[PDB]
Amino acid sequence: SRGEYVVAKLDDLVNWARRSSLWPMTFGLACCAVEMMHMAAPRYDMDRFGVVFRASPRQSDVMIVAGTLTNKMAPALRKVYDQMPEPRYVVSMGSCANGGGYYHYSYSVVRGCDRIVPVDIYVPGCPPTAEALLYGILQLQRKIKREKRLRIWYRR
Amino acid sequence: ELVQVLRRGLQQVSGHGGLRGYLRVLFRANDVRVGTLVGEDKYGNKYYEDNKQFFGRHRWVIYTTEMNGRDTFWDVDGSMVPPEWHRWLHCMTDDP
Amino acid sequence: HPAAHGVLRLVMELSGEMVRKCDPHIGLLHRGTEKLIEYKTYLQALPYFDRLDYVSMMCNEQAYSLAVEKLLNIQPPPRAQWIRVLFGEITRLLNHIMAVTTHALDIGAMTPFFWMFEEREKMFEFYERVSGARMHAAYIRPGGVHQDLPLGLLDDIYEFSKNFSFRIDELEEMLTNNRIWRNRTVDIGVVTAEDALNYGFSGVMLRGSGIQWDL
Amino acid sequence: TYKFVNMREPSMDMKSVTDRAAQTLLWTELVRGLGMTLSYLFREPATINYPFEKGPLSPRFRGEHALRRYPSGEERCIACKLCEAVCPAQAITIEAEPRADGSRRTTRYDIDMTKCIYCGFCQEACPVDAIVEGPNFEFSTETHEELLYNKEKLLNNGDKWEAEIAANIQADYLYR
Amino acid sequence: MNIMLTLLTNVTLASLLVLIAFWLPQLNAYSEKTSPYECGFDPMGSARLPFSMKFFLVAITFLLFDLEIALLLPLPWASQTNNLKTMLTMALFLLILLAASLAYEWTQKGLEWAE
Amino acid sequence: MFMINILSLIIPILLAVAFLTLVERKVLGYMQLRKGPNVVGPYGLLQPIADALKLFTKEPLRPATSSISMFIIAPILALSLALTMWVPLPMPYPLINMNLGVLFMLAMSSLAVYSILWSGWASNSKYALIGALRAVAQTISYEVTLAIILLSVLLMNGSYTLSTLITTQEHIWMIFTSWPLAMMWFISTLAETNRAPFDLTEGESELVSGFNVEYAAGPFAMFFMAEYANIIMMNAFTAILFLGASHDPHTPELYTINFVLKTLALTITFLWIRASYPRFRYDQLMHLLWKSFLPLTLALCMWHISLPIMTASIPPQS
Amino acid sequence: MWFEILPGIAVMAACLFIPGMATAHIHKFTNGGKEKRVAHFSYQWNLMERDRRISGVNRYHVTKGLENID
Ligand SMILES: CCCCCCCCCCCCCCCCC[C@@H](O)O[C@H](CO[C@H](O)CCCCCCCCCCCCCCC)COP(=O)(O)OCC[N+](C)(C)C
Ligand SMILES: CCCCCCCCCCCCCCCCC[C@@H](O)O[C@H](CO[C@H](O)CCCCCCCCCCCCCCC)COP(=O)(O)OCC[N+](C)(C)C
Ligand SMILES: CCCCCCCC/C=C\CCCCCCCC(=O)O[C@H](COC(=O)CCCCCCC/C=C/CCCCCCCC)COP(=O)(O)OCCN
Ligand SMILES: C=C(C)[C@H]1Cc2c(ccc3c2O[C@@H]2COc4cc(OC)c(OC)cc4[C@@H]2C3=O)O1
Ligand code: SF4
Ligand code: SF4
Ligand code: SF4
């Protein structure tokens, strides 16, 4: 069918643009943020993949939870997640964000940020190296490549 | 001089097996450097070195276009390296 | 906020852009570390001190190890103490790079950060070779250090150390004599020596006010 | 033993005054900063071509966990539970019983990878080199459940990474 | 007539870009998403409250100084007159009084922002 | 056929802005010992296209507490004015030939600030308001000095016609006659375009996003395009003003190439400056413009009024 | 690389070439190829209107030389 071919090509084009231009929110919680900085530094240079930090949630596509999420902080993380225009993605980075980690049995720690927001990629480590975070980012790009919103819409 | 740098560029495009191989490596790895083939993989990955590059750029892999079942012409990742070449590539040892 | 330097909620009262009042609200990174330490053995509590101040990991390990060694009435061997002081100074370099470059980045001078973070990366490699981790090493233990240095680490530390002064020089060329940087830094946040002593300040916050004190 | 960082007085001679006036009006130090950035423009960047190029690592590097075997194919782990006792994050869960041939072996061996701090205390504590932190670090998952490792997953990791793990141990065990 | 066409074209292009931006993508607007942004916590007061101007006197002074550029802008044509001696005296007179205005405001601490 | 000319001016400007962004990232990266975009396309040549396609397919957000009419009008005004400032520029022939082209650019640049003002106010958020008020202070700082500098320089031209500037500099660049004015003009263009070290309105480290903090998707993309088109336009104006290319009426493309090369040199100098200096404080910007630039500018205005009469050097036009 | 910045600068330069060259070519095309007449003052406009009147085809650009003097 011609229509199916057209929606497939438009799907690929949109998927390509989104993966290519991923803007994470300038947002860091704890130790893991330091490795995030090392991903932006010369050695790795995330900017060369089209990945640039932007402070505003309105101009951001990706949230990287890089650090422990405490109970006091969870409403603010949820709020800045909700202020991201869609499509939006969340990368959970480090043991603390993934499941609580070293502070899993604390009265003031959220046992995993996926209780608060939906997570796309879980990056293990304490902290994950800058290379491991880069691997997770490229995995998120690969996942975005697989999405077929237009094909799904056409089939409806 | 500048002309010798241009000649280096032309021997770099000549050194990748022609213009189409040059374009393949440029669009597959965003790099067109020429190095000594250290070895090959049982899965098709090729491993090169160039000790005149600074530490970090002196060893690299051109990944296979066809891993176990999936097409990897564009979709490559660091997890495709087998453990022995993983040890060599991350400079844990000097011996391939 | 990029300028927040972490999970800090600073509530400010402002008249125009003038700051009438600062109310720092903290606790957004309170993890209950001390109770958790009360639930661990002395060796199990050591990796918490890595994660207290995540830019000076081995210094925190050293402070905790000194406390426990004092309580145990034992003595680390001389080679361990030399290793500890060497890695404490490397860690001080790491921390000072992070502090100066993030301060410049807030001010607006974004470039020196990228120049200095390659050096930070080279020191992370030193950390990793000795312990297997670029950050939370857990190398310094209440008895000395966990493992002996690998057989070629001193040479690489020497090679790094004989080039770093030029990088500091480039940083100083960028910042020290710039009139914009001096306008953003001279006479800002002036604290007197007596106020610094009473408020509990330590380190540079004392030494900038002329107090002659280094532990 | 101390030095002063800002206790220098400026010369008041006419030549000095004219040099400072030239600095103020013609912006000499700003041109110095421009020269420094221009110098860095012509250097080779320190960037590496990831994933084609990798960052250097060490035999002591702590990565994904694995359970090892003896050369006969028999598992090394004997269920002493020292790794479970030492783990500061309580990330290890162990259940054991006598095997059909009377051997002391585990029936449950879990590591919660989202609890783990990757400290390496368990491989220090293991008396038979059964649990190791292998060299791998590229194991990001798309779901949280994939990071809850059981004994099958860890034995598979050991089987998959033994060639590199043994070579890493051979290069570091004399420092241990 | 050409300039009117140019202005219409530019405004039409910008408005079409806004219309595409608002009608092409999928919108999922909800109350949490549209709430005002203040770094993760809800704002204390209104953003429509009085916001003090500390440079208020420079702003009033800018009004008078801006009108003096209107008086100095015809100077290129005034240099073509035969009474160059009268013209130059008037041009310099206007710039001297302009500088004197700045000197008075500067010395009387008028250029300092209120604290 | 005039419509074809309008399109032939508009579309290439937008393409140059899109690639200017790629150029800034690459220049800043290499100045910071890294590479910048080099994956999305060869040498990152497709990165601007991916950025544009991403921004025009993402969800535009209208704030709940905002005023919609101004909120939507402001980016339209910004982009349309940025495109309109190009029409009187002679390269070497202008699309629109004006007797007072300099005054036209002055007035439209003055009107361009209201995009930032109305955007910040209509967002109805505190950071946007702080950015808008910083724009107010910035305009107050630079406007008088910029106008007087332009007048002092154009006392050598004899008119406000932009094409006459080509004839004036037939033998020598005007920067050899008025370099003290050129320095202050360059700094005032940095302030007027909200560029570092004078980029107070965005205030990224300080105010997160400044005036457009509440803008997303396409409207934010329009603000970004307007700002970069203004960078190019102001540098082209400076190149025409101070570094006058020689024009052969039978081979105008030589002038076009020379002028474009000079404009690129000045824009690259803007990007070079952004990577070298810390940000000003906005009251310090006001004090710099009012206590240093203004007295020198007044004195040099008197000097440039007196000098042609002193040496019998008055230019031709009425 | 630093010479990898050059492709983007070349694209931008090519884009910035187009407006001036296009304006020159369109001026030549619509003005008879002899350059667009400039009318800053009413005397030049009067000359243009006289040219249009005497051109016999209502085009200012068409020029009548000494072949109209019998
Ligand atoms: C007049 C025009 C109006 C519309 C203008 C819109 C802009 C024109 C369209 C521009 C499209 C250019 C983008 C496509 C480039 C694809 C790049 C290519 O390399 O992607 C490959 C795959 O290509 C994509 O699957 C398809 C991209 C194109 C899809 C069809 C595009 C059709 C365009 C039709 C335009 C229609 C406009 C409709 C509105 C009018 C895989 O690469 P990737 O895996 O990432 O690489 C990872 C990094 N590695 C390689 C180093 C590891
Ligand atoms: C580069 C600058 C110039 C561009 C040049 C092209 C200009 C493009 C025009 C700009 C608009 C772009 C919008 C593209 C998507 C279409 C949106 C809308 O127009 O379509 C629907 C219009 O349909 C409406 O439901 C009404 C349909 C019928 C009611 C009134 C229409 C009467 C016309 C009669 C049609 C019958 C056949 C006519 C044959 C000629 C509205 O659906 P809606 O969900 O809200 O909007 C979201 C669109 N999504 C889904 C793609 C995300
Ligand atoms: C025979 C009669 C001749 C008539 C006299 C001619 C000779 C005149 C000699 C003096 C000319 C000096 C002109 C310079 C004007 C500004 C000088 C100045 O004082 O400004 C500085 C500040 O100005 C700056 O430094 C600007 C800061 C921002 C810098 C941004 C980038 C730096 C510029 C890059 C290169 C510029 C290239 C410009 C030319 C471009 C080509 C058009 C003052 O500030 P402070 O040092 O803080 O001290 C005053 C309060 N105590
Ligand atoms: C923007 C670039 C090039 C770098 C700098 C940077 C990031 C990402 C995130 C942040 C950041 O710097 C700011 C300011 O300084 C710290 C210091 C921190 O601790 C040292 C910390 O931990 C949460 C967070 C921050 C900010 C932060 O979130 O990439
Ligand atoms: S996972 Fe580890 S490194 Fe990351 S924030 Fe938590 S304790 Fe710090
Ligand atoms: S590495 Fe540390 S936290 Fe992880 S399982 Fe071993 S002992 Fe527990
Ligand atoms: S892995 Fe080692 S320490 Fe843990 S139970 Fe088995 S034998 Fe004991």
mmCIF file of C-alpha atoms and ligand atoms in Angstrom, chain A residues 102, chain D residues 62-63 65 83 86-92 109 111-113 115-123 131 133, ligand 6:
data_model
loop_
_atom_site.group_PDB
_atom_site.id
_atom_site.type_symbol
_atom_site.label_atom_id
_atom_site.label_comp_id
_atom_site.label_asym_id
_atom_site.label_seq_id
_atom_site.Cartn_x
_atom_site.Cartn_y
_atom_site.Cartn_z
ATOM 1 C CA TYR A 102 22.916 2.244 49.611
ATOM 2 C CA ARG D 62 34.609 -3.368 39.262
ATOM 3 C CA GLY D 63 31.815 -4.268 36.883
ATOM 4 C CA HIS D 65 28.948 -9.570 38.927
ATOM 5 C CA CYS D 83 29.465 -12.229 50.746
ATOM 6 C CA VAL D 86 29.718 -8.400 54.361
ATOM 7 C CA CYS D 87 27.523 -6.688 51.770
ATOM 8 C CA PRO D 88 26.925 -3.124 53.023
ATOM 9 C CA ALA D 89 23.803 -2.736 50.871
ATOM 10 C CA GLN D 90 22.277 -6.139 51.785
ATOM 11 C CA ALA D 91 22.104 -6.784 48.047
ATOM 12 C CA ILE D 92 22.858 -10.533 48.266
ATOM 13 C CA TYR D 109 21.851 -16.769 44.938
ATOM 14 C CA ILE D 111 22.070 -9.953 43.739
ATOM 15 C CA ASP D 112 19.783 -6.919 43.565
ATOM 16 C CA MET D 113 21.758 -4.749 41.146
ATOM 17 C CA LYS D 115 20.744 -2.122 45.723
ATOM 18 C CA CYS D 116 24.396 -2.863 44.942
ATOM 19 C CA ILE D 117 26.993 -0.110 45.390
ATOM 20 C CA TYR D 118 29.642 -1.993 43.374
ATOM 21 C CA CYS D 119 32.167 -1.794 46.229
ATOM 22 C CA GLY D 120 33.812 -5.162 45.580
ATOM 23 C CA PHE D 121 33.695 -6.187 49.236
ATOM 24 C CA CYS D 122 32.044 -9.491 48.319
ATOM 25 C CA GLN D 123 34.853 -10.642 46.046
ATOM 26 C CA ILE D 131 31.720 -14.200 43.246
ATOM 27 C CA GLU D 133 32.915 -8.188 39.705
HETATM 28 S S1 SF4 H 6 29.694 -5.108 45.264
HETATM 29 FE FE1 SF4 H 6 29.285 -4.455 47.409
HETATM 30 S S2 SF4 H 6 27.090 -3.851 47.404
HETATM 31 FE FE2 SF4 H 6 27.429 -5.055 45.498
HETATM 32 S S3 SF4 H 6 26.876 -7.193 46.083
HETATM 33 FE FE3 SF4 H 6 29.124 -6.996 46.408
HETATM 34 S S4 SF4 H 6 29.309 -6.399 48.600
HETATM 35 FE FE4 SF4 H 6 27.137 -6.039 48.036
#
